[PDB]
A paper describes a structure:
The similarity of eukaryotic actin to crenactin, a filament-forming protein from the crenarchaeon [name] supports the theory of a common origin of Crenarchaea and Eukaryotes. Attempts to trace back the origins of today's eukaryotic F-actin filaments led to the discovery of crenactin found in certain organisms of the order Thermoproteales within the phylum Crenarchaeota (Crenarchaea, part of the 'TACK' superphylum). Hence, it has been proposed that crenactin filaments share a common ancestor with F-actin. In [name], crenactin is encoded within the arcade cluster of genes, together with four arcadins, and has been proposed to be part of a cell-shape maintenance system.
Here, we present the near-atomic resolution structure of double-stranded crenactin filaments at 3.8 Å by [name], revealing their close relationship to F-actin. Crenactin forms right-handed, double-stranded, staggered filaments with a rise of 25.6 Å (half a subunits' length, hence staggered) between subunits and a twist of 198.1° (1-start, rotating between the two strands, equivalent to -161.9°). These values are very similar to the parameters of the eukaryotic F-actin filament, with a rise of 27.5 Å and a twist of 193.6° (equivalent to −166.4°). In our filament structure presented here, we observed a dramatic rearrangement of the hydrophobic plug, moving it upwards, towards subdomain IB, by as much as 21 Å. In this new position, the loop interacts extensively with subunits of the opposite strand, essentially the same function as the hydrophobic plug has in F-actin. In addition to the hydrophobic plug, a hydrophilic interaction between subdomain IIB on one strand and subdomain IA on the opposite strand helps to keep the double filament architecture stable. For longitudinal assembly, crenactin subunits within the same strand are held together via three main areas of interactions. Particularly significant is the well-conserved D-loop (DNase I binding loop) located within subdomain IB. Folded into a small alpha helix, it interacts with the previous subunit via a surface usually referred to as the 'hydrophobic groove' in actin. Furthermore, the ATPase active site is also highly conserved with key residues, such as the nucleophilic water activator Q164 (Q137 in actin), in the same place in both structures.
Author numbering:
A (entry chain D), B (entry chain A), C (entry chain B): 5 to 430
The structure:
């Protein structure tokens, strides 16, 4: 039906960090941190303390639902699984979708529907652009299973940048998503340019890993293991330089500006010492231009120490700067239209967030000011006409696009594997 | 069976001082002071006076059973064996378990069962967290031998802090056991955190040894040798300072407040003189924070005199404060949950008992008020939100947890050496 | 000059345990156990007994120089500072470099130079790969101060694995250092692969801490506090299993093979009892593969007891096996060359030492045989072609590389912070 959509059209975003979800009726979507928590090796002592309903399905997911079941850090680095490592779950990983299943299951269960006119939801999923074929097939399999439990009339999937352009309803610009895992820049002329869509393998999660290194170098290593901890630290102590080299010089001259103290929990309060105060810049900068002799040295000597198993989640080989990303995304649109499409740049998603702490504007920079000054370095003639803008409520964006897309996607259009578009029915 | 448990589930605690025991049916457990009494070198004169049944097994154990067989102090410091010196019996000591055997034998024999429906007990043992592997294997060997005498259907063992958390059924807090021998602090989130469990090697028995030194300095040394004597003295004359340095200053200014007279027996009545009246504080304080230039001097110069053999049971090297213990136990749980788990602090066990004698509240402090003020000194930001509580009937606690754990521990779960959990059958 | 180098080129290694040092002229370097001994709280009684020269600088360092100033164990666990806890001194610790200063000062003072042609030394320092930026800057500050005292023409610093590859002058292999604090595995093709260099945070010092636990479980705890004591015990009683599980099974079947008696001092002679005889394996094994349900249980229940302050120096979260370390270090070199570079494996450094005591070869294994059988478990196809070798004089190695590197490092090459290579001049 039609007005049936304005109620029961149900958007879902995944991305890496937060799974943003809700029906179209919401003003802004509810969030679930993507982490699933396994309950797997349990001393029968603790199984006595777990409700047999929760332990039955073998996981728990959601912000509040997991917090209650969290044991010590050793438990966290084991049984707390962040699937969607970057935008994507490796096929071979059974634990990867096992959480996504009950993460998606948690999503719908959160919103019951009393109305007997309810024929089942309309589930608009927004995956990352990097999502391969199997990740589509896998997640439709997920919602096919929830069809037996919940009422789902139809399921669709849209690439994440497609949502944002729909969310902004912007006519001419290059969308840039700050997605935690991946940065997806797409130009849009009258709509997405699928050929010009460019999605980096880098994201906010690379700002964690550059923080997760700092907290190891300060001797907080117990804190590093817990991903929530570096999150709070990164978000609080992370900072974006105007120009990295000029900034680090500044922070080594007058560190007292940059020394910060973050209270994670009453026991553990992270003090960024006087010396490393300049490393605050590497935290927020590595999202944008992770090519510098200053970072690429600091990341290299931080790749040496291998604590548990992982060598660290980050790439030593170097990536493309989001300045160079936007440019590369534009060379794929037509020279006719490039003057128009390169006018606006919409920054969106999480990793473009950073707010300059007050009084520090002479050195730090907002994500907006960063991109604008990033273009001046590479393509000067471009940065003249560029008006770069950050979305209001950056991370809520993709979901707002997911429902609008999900709202108008004529329901007689079947999902066909070849076109990778349209509804599928259970 | 099931309702069979609500009767014949049988909890046993050991700990150092009192072995707390009984079936689940009891309101509070019966106690046996852990002391075994050897009858070993007996002039045939006295063997004539001993029933040949008692002398046959070579020991006696229990409060009333030993009192009748106690000879002079020389006999007490010899043939009265306190096993479980701290939480643990050294493997090499045959006398150590030989008492525990007949101490555990005394425990079950105390409770005969008339009902022919009785298939044997369910013995839930609570050992100290410090109990090594052999101490588990040794005590199962004990109950395997009592299987031939008594009816024991199944035997299990739980670490002592696991009991308390079950006894309190507290969801978020850090348990602190005042166990006579050892202080075992564990955080609990939905249940014990085995990684965060921290057990000090210090306990109430270190408050004896600091009293046992005082009674030597007052010239009562005949009284010191008898462990029951310092017990009654410690419990009566022992006291817990608000702040040790401020307190000792007070007690040296106005000693008449603190001069006390304890009647042990009609012959021997201990008068804490006017001078040492300040040493009452070191008695109760050394349980909490045994690092002070005032104690660590007094314990050092009291380590010099070596009377019989032992140099004294106490550590000159210094230990961790229970304030620092709780903190160290929290750094092992996840920064996510630390805000919640650090809220409540449950004090339990014997060594957190002390009651301020009336009118003295301006200087002394209850164990509760002591811990709360202990945290303010170390981790100020923690002590703001901390609500610290003492268990009603502090020492009875562990047993109450031992039965509940012993009540539900599904009986098809075998004891497996690797997991160190579950029932074993004889 | 040139031939001036063949005399006055002066190598210095730090590492954790032994600081190996000497001029290039030596056959093998002289050693200094890294321990500094503070003289800090001294009763004026003892200051009368200390030469005012020694007490002036406030420390003493060196094997013989400290032995003479050692008081009781309480003094040792306080005023005997092992800096470089693992490979690294925490910035905030003033006591950390204060020893390194006079430790390095002790080093040069040991070797006076009579020749008036002597223009000052050439100091080649070998730090650990984990050495951060500040640890470089700190130690150059050290040698800048010794420039006023001694004659130092030039100072350089090389990462420790760089030395070994130079010391061996091996063309194709993966160096593995058994460094007391840390295990640094690097592949070398025509030289070090800085990207493939992988340095574990585990080392011989984790074999102490697993012995330091054993000596607490045997009741020698007075002996545990003294790091020299566990050293001699570890080196003597420590043993490396062929396969840990198969070995522990063997040692619990026939303990009389493994019961050992080590004479530390005429008073104290450590008898590893019959029972724990199997724990000899955990001593030497935890260097290699500290992931086992057998160790990771024994280390966990040994982390509970906290004696003085420290919870114990060791990581409960688990580390990477040196088998998996070598593999992870190879995935960073190019698939073209991996066939060649994975041929030889040079084991080096202290923690790869262990000699099977005679007649026990059926169960124990040399460090060589251990690594070779370690690879067979993980990467079978690799272990076929692998020829693994241990350096002759394992621990002397890094210094031998330090001088050769220090010998040819063209002196017109300045130290530049960015490249982290080359000479600096005072
Ligand atoms: N105030 C902030 N400053 C810096 N980074 C932030 C801030 N708030 C959120 N973030 C980052 O944004 C990320 C959220 O992005 P997200 O929408 O999950 O991307 P996607 O869902 O596409 O993977 C978080 O992982 C976090 O690291
Ligand atoms: N009123 C009191 N004041 C101070 N200490 C007390 C008091 N009552 C009991 N105690 C101490 O508590 C101890 C009992 O603790 P207990 O339960 O035996 O510990 P565990 O059993 O774990 O070893 C006794 O040794 C005694 O010293
Ligand atoms: N025979 C031996 N058996 C086992 N371990 C040994 C033996 N000899 C020395 N070791 C260990 O080797 C270590 C020396 O390594 P070292 O060269 O100090 O490493 P680094 O200097 O890189 O820190 C000592 O700490 C000791 O524990």
């Amino acid at each position: 039906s039609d007005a049936y959509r304005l109620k029961y059209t149900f958007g879902v975003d995944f991305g890496t960090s937060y799974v943003k979800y809700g029906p179209i009726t919401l003003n802004e979507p509810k969030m679930v941190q993507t982490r699933g928590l396994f309950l797997r090796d349990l001393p029968e002592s603790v199984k006595m303390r777990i409700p047999p309903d929760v332990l039955a399905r073998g996981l728990v997911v959601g912000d509040e639902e997991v917090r209650k079941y969290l044991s010590s850090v050793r438990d966290v680095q084991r049984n707390l699984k962040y699937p969607l490592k970057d935008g994507v779950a490796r096929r071979d990983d059974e634990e990867a979708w096992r959480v996504l299943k009950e993460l998606a299951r948690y999503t719908l269960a959160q919103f019951p529907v009393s109305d007997p006119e309810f024929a089942g939801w309309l589930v608009a999923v927004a995956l990352s652009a990097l999502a391969p074929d199997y990740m589509y097939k896998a997640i439709f399999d997920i919602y096919d299973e929830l069809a037996s439990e919940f009422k789902i009339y139809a399921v669709t999937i849209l690439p994440q940048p497609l949502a944002v352009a729909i969310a902004e309803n912007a006519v001419n610009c290059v969308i840039v998503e700050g997605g935690h895992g991946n940065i997806q820049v797409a130009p849009i002329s009258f709509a997405l340019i699928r050929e010009g869509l460019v999605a980096l393998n880098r994201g906010g999660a690379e700002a964690n890993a550059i923080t997760r290194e700092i907290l190891k170098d300060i001797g907080y290593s117990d804190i590093a293991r817990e991903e929530y901890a570096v999150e709070v630290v990164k978000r609080a102590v992370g900072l974006v330089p105007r120009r990295l080299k000029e900034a680090i010089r500044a922070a080594k001259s007058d560190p007292d500006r940059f020394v910060t103290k973050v209270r994670l929990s009453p026991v553990v309060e992270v003090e960024i010492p006087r010396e490393y105060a300049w490393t605050r810049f590497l935290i927020g900068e590595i999202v944008f231009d992770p090519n510098h002799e200053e970072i690429k040295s600091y990341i290299e000597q931080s790749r040496l120490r291998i604590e548990n198993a992982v060598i660290g989640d980050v790439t030593l080989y170097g990536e493309m700067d989001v300045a160079s990303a936007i440019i590369t995304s534009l060379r794929n649109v037509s020279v006719e239209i490039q003057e128009r499409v390169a006018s606006q740049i919409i920054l969106s998603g999480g990793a473009f967030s950073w707010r300059v702490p007050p009084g520090m504007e002479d050195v730090a920079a907002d994500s907006v000011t960063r991109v604008k000054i990033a273009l001046e370095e590479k393509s000067p003639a471009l940065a003249s006409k560029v008006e770069v803008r950050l979305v209001s409520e950056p991370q809520y964006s993709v979901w707002r696009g997911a429902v609008i897309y999900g709202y108008a996607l004529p329901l007689s259009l079947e999902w066909s594997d070849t076109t990778r578009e349209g509804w599928r029915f259970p």
